[PDB]
Amino acid sequence: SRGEYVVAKLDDLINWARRSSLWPMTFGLACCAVEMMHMAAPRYDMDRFGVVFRASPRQSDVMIVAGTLTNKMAPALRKVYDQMPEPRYVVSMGSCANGGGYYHYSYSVVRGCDRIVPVDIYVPGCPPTAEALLYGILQLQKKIKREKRLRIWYRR
Template identity: 75%
Template sequence: MSAVVEYLKAPVHDLFAWARISSMWPVTFGLACCAVEMMHVAAARYDLERYGIFFRPTPRQSDAMIIAGTLTNKMAPALRKVWDQMAEPRYSVSMGSCANGGGYYHFSYHVVRGADQIIPVDVYVPGCPPTAEALLYGVYMLQKKIKRNPYRKEIMEQDFNQPGKLYRAEKELSVSDNLKLLKQQE
């Protein structure tokens, strides 16, 4: 009996994978200049809608989030709130140097050094700002990841699943700490 059940589960698994990758609905979290490239990829030349990707205005209708731009300490709680409102399984794409690790503003006191300190990130798209082709490739990589595991069975760290919790580096850097780090790099 278990062999028959396994045989029937395989096509269902493939159907769910196909449905998830063919109808990805990301919510946009545009914070800076990378958001312009995100708008560019939705325009006529690249047209994400051909791939079944429709930007949604609300996180409750979305299953992915594209974080584009510099994430500040004041914006981090809003990012976490939007992330908590999304239904499971949910995915995220960090777009640009600032969202990936702080970018040019890495040593600034008000910048979060990567969106992965606030929410789990599935795909990183490098660049300052990344091109529309790079974002398309990042979305393609996310689709490949979803196809491998459409149910999101790999559970992230348990802490990431606690709603409303912010994730920070162990020590916040002060202005004097940032100046010391800059002098060490010279």
């Protein structure tokens, strides 16, 4: 089982490397944007976790979508989403964006970002507090711990 064990440790290596940093792009429409800038605050640091806020979309690993996503917003959202590399994850933050929520019975408003992008981490709250959002990002990293990607390529 020498090849299986060394490929398993190799998969652990690359999964640990991906779950290390994950510097996103911070999309941030409405007041959930202010809550993201306040989980950049000194009480809760992103940069303890390799998480650098940077709006460069070509080198963005995950993407937090938050704020009130509108029908006038959505095509530019998916055009941002296409030019983003295949290791990609979507964290839907906030009661506006994770299912419509408060502006749910309203024209020109997308009924949550399930209908636009594939969604990985739902985090509710209004605003979802920095503790809750940081808990969601650690749970995202534990999803990265449970991936078995290179094992599937091995026994494929």
